[PDB]
Amino acid sequence: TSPVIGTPWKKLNAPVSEEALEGVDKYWRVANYLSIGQIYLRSNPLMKEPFTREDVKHRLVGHWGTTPGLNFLIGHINRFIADHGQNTVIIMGPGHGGPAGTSQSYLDGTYTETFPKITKDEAGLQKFFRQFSYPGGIPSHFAPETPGSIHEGGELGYALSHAYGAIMDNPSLFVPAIVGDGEAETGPLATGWQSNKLVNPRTDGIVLPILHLNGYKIANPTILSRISDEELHEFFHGMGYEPYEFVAGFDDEDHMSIHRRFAELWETIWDEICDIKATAQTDNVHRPFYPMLIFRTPKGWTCPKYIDGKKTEGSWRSHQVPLASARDTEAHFEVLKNWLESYKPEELFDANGAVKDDVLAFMPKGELRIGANPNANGGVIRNDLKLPNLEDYEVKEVAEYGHGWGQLEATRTLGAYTRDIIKNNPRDFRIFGPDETASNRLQASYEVTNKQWDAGYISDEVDEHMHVSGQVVEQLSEHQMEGFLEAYLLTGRHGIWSSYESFVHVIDSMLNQHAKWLEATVREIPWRKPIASMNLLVSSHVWRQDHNGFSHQDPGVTSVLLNKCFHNDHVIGIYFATDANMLLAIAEKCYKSTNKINAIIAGKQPAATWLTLDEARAELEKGAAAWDWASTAKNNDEAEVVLAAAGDVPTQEIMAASDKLKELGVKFKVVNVADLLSLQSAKENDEALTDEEFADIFTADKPVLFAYHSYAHDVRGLIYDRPNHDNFNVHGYEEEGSTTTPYDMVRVNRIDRYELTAEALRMIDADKYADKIDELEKFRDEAFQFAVDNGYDHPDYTDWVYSGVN
Amino acid sequence: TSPVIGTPWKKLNAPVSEEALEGVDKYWRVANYLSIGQIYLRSNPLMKEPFTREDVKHRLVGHWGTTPGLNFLIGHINRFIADHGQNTVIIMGPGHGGPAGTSQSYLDGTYTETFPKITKDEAGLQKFFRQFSYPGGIPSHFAPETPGSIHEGGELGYALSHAYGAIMDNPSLFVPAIVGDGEAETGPLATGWQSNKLVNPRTDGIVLPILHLNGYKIANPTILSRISDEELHEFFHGMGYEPYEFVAGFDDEDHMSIHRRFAELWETIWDEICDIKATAQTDNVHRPFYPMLIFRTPKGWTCPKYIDGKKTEGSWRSHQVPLASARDTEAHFEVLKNWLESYKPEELFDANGAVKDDVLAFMPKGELRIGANPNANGGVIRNDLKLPNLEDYEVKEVAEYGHGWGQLEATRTLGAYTRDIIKNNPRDFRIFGPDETASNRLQASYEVTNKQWDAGYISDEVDEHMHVSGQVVEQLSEHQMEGFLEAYLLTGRHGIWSSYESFVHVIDSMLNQHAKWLEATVREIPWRKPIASMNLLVSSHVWRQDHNGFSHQDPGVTSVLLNKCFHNDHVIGIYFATDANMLLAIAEKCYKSTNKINAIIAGKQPAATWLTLDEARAELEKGAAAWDWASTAKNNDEAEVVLAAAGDVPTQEIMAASDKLKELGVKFKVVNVADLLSLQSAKENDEALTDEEFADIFTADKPVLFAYHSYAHDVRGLIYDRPNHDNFNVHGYEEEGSTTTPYDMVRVNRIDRYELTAEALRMIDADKYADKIDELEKFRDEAFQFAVDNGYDHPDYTDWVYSGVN
Numbered sequence A, B: 001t002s003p004v005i006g007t008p009w010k011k012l013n014a015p016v017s018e019e020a021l022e023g024v025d026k027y028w029r030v031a032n033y034l035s036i037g038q039i040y041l042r043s044n045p046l047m048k049e050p051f052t053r054e055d056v057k058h059r060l061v062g063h064w065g066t067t068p069g070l071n072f073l074i075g076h077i078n079r080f081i082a083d084h085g086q087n088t089v090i091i092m093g094p095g096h097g098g099p100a101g102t103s104q105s106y107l108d109g110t111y112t113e114t115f116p117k118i119t120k121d122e123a124g125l126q127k128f129f130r131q132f133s134y135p136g137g138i139p140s141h142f143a144p145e146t147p148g149s150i151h152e153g154g155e156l157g158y159a160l161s162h163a164y165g166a167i168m169d170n171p172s173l174f175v176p177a178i179v180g181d182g183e184a185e186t187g188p189l190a191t192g193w194q195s196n197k198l199v200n201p202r203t204d205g206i207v208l209p210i211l212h213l214n215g216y217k218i219a220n221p222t223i224l225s226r227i228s229d230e231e232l233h234e235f236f237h238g239m240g241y242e243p244y245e246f247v248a249g250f251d252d253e254d255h256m257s258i259h260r261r262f263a264e265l266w267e268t269i270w271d272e273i274c275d276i277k278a279t280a281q282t283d284n285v286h287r288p289f290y291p292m293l294i295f296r297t298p299k300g301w302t303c304p305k306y307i308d309g310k311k312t313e314g315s316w317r318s319h320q321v322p323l324a325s326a327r328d329t330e331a332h333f334e335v336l337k338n339w340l341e342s343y344k345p346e347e348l349f350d351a352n353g354a355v356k357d358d359v360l361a362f363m364p365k366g367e368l369r370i371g372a373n374p375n376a377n378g379g380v381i382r383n384d385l386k387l388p389n390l391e392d393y394e395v396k397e398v399a400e401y402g403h404g405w406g407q408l409e410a411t412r413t414l415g416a417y418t419r420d421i422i423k424n425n426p427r428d429f430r431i432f433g434p435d436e437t438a439s440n441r442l443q444a445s446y447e448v449t450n451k452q453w454d455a456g457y458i459s460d461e462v463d464e465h466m467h468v469s470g471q472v473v474e475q476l477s478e479h480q481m482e483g484f485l486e487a488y489l490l491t492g493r494h495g496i497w498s499s500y501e502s503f504v505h506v507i508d509s510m511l512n513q514h515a516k517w518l519e520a521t522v523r524e525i526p527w528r529k530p531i532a533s534m535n536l537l538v539s540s541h542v543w544r545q546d547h548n549g550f551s552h553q554d555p556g557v558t559s560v561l562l563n564k565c566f567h568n569d570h571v572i573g574i575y576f577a578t579d580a581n582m583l584l585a586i587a588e589k590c591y592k593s594t595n596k597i598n599a600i601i602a603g604k605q606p607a608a609t610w611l612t613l614d615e616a617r618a619e620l621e622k623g624a625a626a627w628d629w630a631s632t633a634k635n636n637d638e639a640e641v642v643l644a645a646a647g648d649v650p651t652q653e654i655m656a657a658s659d660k661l662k663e664l665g666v667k668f669k670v671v672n673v674a675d676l677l678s679l680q681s682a683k684e685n686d687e688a689l690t691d692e693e694f695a696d697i698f699t700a701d702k703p704v705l706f707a708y709h710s711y712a713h714d715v716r717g718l719i720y721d722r723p724n725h726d727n728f729n730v731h732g733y734e735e736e737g738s739t740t741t742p743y744d745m746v747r748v749n750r751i752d753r754y755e756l757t758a759e760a761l762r763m764i765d766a767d768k769y770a771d772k773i774d775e776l777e778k779f780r781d782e783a784f785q786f787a788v789d790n791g792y793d794h795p796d797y798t799d800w801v802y803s804g805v806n
């Protein structure tokens, strides 16, 4: 559960003290000095003479155009957290301002705790300076290695979705979400503005969006900064916000004056937020206007105004590095030396090199710190889900009526299971879906919870299962759902989210980024505890898009997921639910797991059930298993072909083809691969099937016919070094489809039962079976003409039931 | 179910024709002429010469100060109903404007249909004129004998509650509720203004309040007319209305100019109403501002301006009768003759005396007429409730563990029964309660319906079971609830309403009025079909008001109900539920009944159960029955006393006293009277117990001890001519109570078990039982001192269970 920390939502009821703002100004100066020492210096952190070009880095990498503004906001937020005792997580949208975050971690004392070799003295300062963006050092962005970070910020557009996710079901947590003005042009964040219509001020926390409007992107100005102030305020008010505006640094006003003005503006905003929270305890049915801060400052605000006669401060020329070579001229080194001395570090550091005590007296202590906040490290919060007994949801008719029974929909079983998980776990488990929960048949959870909706209600003929609080969030944006769930998991909670297969590509970037958060975490960051897994139910898949057609058919999610399987990280799982029982086993395993991205590919269509629960779990631990009840060959020597399958429709076609093969006396084996990554190379993947086990499943000399859900490229690229891999003949999706009957969909991809039987016959003896092969091939065309003439699939195809049903 | 009539909520989308307003003016003139002929004329309706004082009534009775304004509004509403085809019921708040209603019934043709002897010619006009307020004629007010009337209007303050009741669950019905400005000063109607917060524009109809602000009461001006127009509009807007205002007749403007102006204003109001209705089909969660019309006119608007030098028109002098004696002077007769000729009746009537055809061409036809509308005669709409099987709700533990078992609450059984009646009958059965449904334990109906509430919603920690539509209405006003239910029944629907016993007095007037609507209906009005019964669950009665005390104890409802039992009308039923099974039988009988007021007095406290369902019904058909299982005497000769009871606490005390009497060998009988009115005189009440049956129940010579719920006066006034009535010793409530333990409440009223045993012993032998009587009397005082010392009742009293429990 999310803990209550400090004294949440308290008003100051006093002026901001002068001593605190003294401390805030000194903090800002020292944070800018650290952020510059990290970029430019490799030695001599405190500029003991001789300070020469020997002390400067050979290759200057990093960013400065956002760092002083971030340091300003972070120092003021630190004063605020010390004063109010607020439970606060900062989300840094422009993550390229990494030196700001590392300077915070260093100054609040958490960096030395996490990394003991970076001491708080001259040698520790030298190591801290050298390690930024260095061989064998720390990254340039706001990284998982950086304490106090739940968001990398490298790939832009997801500060707001992550903020609204982090506050969900989390009522005491305050999140200032700093948003770059260039990042605000990206598609994800524009729609992430509208997510205050999906949170409740009573049951969820408060997100304060700080638009960091410094006017410029890389080498280009931002649209928001160059439209009129009337337009900007009107725009933010049309999205349910009260815009506040702060402008600074565009004239010669004293810094103390700027800090004072910001103190007053910040406390005004905090009082509006506290009023909203206090009102929500009585009335939470009508939405408030949350304050949001527009923070207009010059880009690179403390750097030299002009360098080489080019406007540097207040321009895009300060984005990455002013003084691109302070190492190769004497004039640029003098500019750099003057820039470092303009902060007066001589008074901010003591003799031994530690930041002076009066510079950090205004700082929060203990669990209130940014790097120490448990919501930033959501693995220490996390507790296991309390799971219902799986045998309660098993489809038992397979156990007595025989394999292949029924016309059930696989995802309804997961719906019931997830409903009871929600029942056992309220306020820790949440279901997201881009308008598609009821189309993936996960609506059984409406028996115990509602869709959280905080826009207007109009009627009850149209607004069923909607409520101002709920455990089902549903907005038509995959970016929103994925950011919500990722921030939900990163804070310590659990969740599933469902989607159409073809639109998972919309978040290929986001998944990639999350994999990079996991790949980095499992490799080099032990102090970050495991978080829950990102569970993605992929349904309404390529083979059954009757209503939509070719635009909704693209199973390429498997390919993008296969690219993140390296160095024994195991941060990826791709599971194929052949039926409801296998889906139960997969979902149980996935809900128990940690630090992974689990894509469970299950169909919503009426499909037969093949396994019992014990059989399903037994197939699960191996990933691939032989179906002894479907095989006609007792041992590996007898079979004239191995028929392997991965996916519900490929499984159905393999089984129907096996029925026809039985009538011709063909001895074959039947294999089902539930988990794709078990087929990976044994030396590469230590949890994949060993080579002996793989050869036992697939006969070394005998041909293997493989029917696969996605593109066959993904199977062939995975088994390349496996034994008997030359004989594998993968049949997968082949970018051929439309709106048409279900048999046609598999016909045009050469994955129907007739084509599979003909493929197996050709693997054995093309000459002996020539007449039967011809008969099958002309039957495919007759059965297509049947669907054209009559509008539905052939009775031979529709009515087929496996021979193993009693 | 409420029928859909005509084409509801249709906009005209055209100007009001000139021909229609020609007709409206001619209608208004002829309606005023009829309303004056009724008051003043007994002969010569069309003033054929010689028109002399012979033609005038000897005793002029009736009212005129509201009649021409009512005729104006009714003629315009008639034009509106003809044009739009609206389902409309008019509620006439100032019911003393009876000639207006009878003139309408006469002019739209329904009066001749209902009363064939009032033809539409000269003789019929003469009879119509003479019969108003005459010996052997029709009443002065807007009476049940008057077609098109659901509201008498004699006793003021309930036009608005009746309107909002008539539109409930009735979505196509339009109700213009005409409200007198003096009547608006009464307490009931002031709170009946606020009832637009309890109706839904989608599921309920539309009430248009027309404030008939003619400035004067009887001999006094009204508060609303003499406050500023700003105040009046501000007041009506603070109650959720849009005030429209029409002013007429206060200058020399032409009548047509007034009819035209009213046509535009009326169509504007209708368009706002139609907009509200169309919006409600999409959004019904947010309350609209319903239009209401302020209709400022001079009182007695077409009468002579001055009579005897006194301002008559536009004054309170025109309330009842200008020209109080047009029979006793020649000058007043000339004033009357000029008044009648000012309407030019010579052109409004043909030779034979019928109203000319062009005067009524604009009139509605068929079912759309006011007197023909089925919602005015709610007995033709009515259908029986579909009732669940009673045996499903029986308390079966009495059948096997023995009589006297348990500590159940009686009203929870009725709650479950009513819940299933609601389930079987949605939109035809409704539960009302003055904030007291959950305190009478009728909340089992929240399993199938909600409280209808259309004010604001704030949270869900406080707003459970509330919804913009529902079958439970609940406002803290007994007037509101009773008017809602009475208009609900008068329109054809069914309902229960619950209340504390002591506050039923708040509606003694209203009940009286409804009884007068029923007494008149069952005697002389056959064409009015039976309506459902007014069912009043009286709970939280006098004997168990622990929290409240003396202010909440007044059982005087029985007395006011007994005053309406005359002439074999049977419009009253008073039932005492001794336990849950008897309550089931009573409620089943009451829900089946028609044209009655059924007061069911049941306790909400934990009380023992004495009867099985079959026994309860067997006691029910007789009203009084002997308990053979509790009697120690086999025949009427053996018993030395008869112990009779009526009420759950009196029943408990009789049974506990019978237990003590058994230990002393006393032979007694036990009688329970479920229905009070069976004890009435046989010759007076043909459905009461005959004299032989009464003597069989109560032994002729043997003393009878009667324990009664209410004041003993009510029992003694009922059995006065019955045999053995001299020996009856009634023990009832005696205005002695407080906040104290339950035994104390019956102690201070001489109705406890010890005092009852002593009473019975004194009836037999005071001398023989002197020691035992003394012991009982001092035990009462010891058991009171026990409660004073320890705070709860004696173990001898609390723990007592009947000896018949196995």
Ligand SMILES: Cc1ncc(C[n+]2csc(CCOP(=O)(O)OP(=O)(O)O)c2C)c(N)n1
Pocket: A065, A066, A094, A096, A153, A154, A155, A156, A157, A179, A180, A181, A182, A183, A184, A186, A212, A214, A215, A216, A217, A218, A222, A299, A319
């Ligand atoms: C989607 C995406 N496109 C491009 C980039 C490359 N990039 C890195 S930083 C940056 C500019 C930062 O813009 P802004 O939000 O205005 O930041 P600031 O002014 O704080 O530097 C860009 C385009 C990116 N990170 N993500």
Ligand SMILES: Cc1ncc(C[n+]2csc(CCOP(=O)(O)OP(=O)(O)O)c2C)c(N)n1
Pocket: B065, B066, B094, B096, B153, B154, B155, B156, B157, B179, B180, B181, B182, B183, B184, B186, B212, B214, B215, B216, B217, B218, B222, B299, B319
């Ligand atoms: C509660 C109540 N008190 C007193 C009366 C006696 N009464 C009969 S008519 C009347 C005056 C009518 O007043 P208002 O509503 O202004 O009627 P209008 O101006 O239409 O005559 C009164 C007081 C009554 N009917 N009801």
Ligand SMILES: [Mg+2]
Pocket: A180, A181, A182, A212, A213, A214, A215, A216, A217, A222
């Ligand atoms: Mg920018």
Ligand SMILES: [Mg+2]
Pocket: B180, B181, B182, B212, B213, B214, B215, B216, B217, B222
């Ligand atoms: Mg008046």
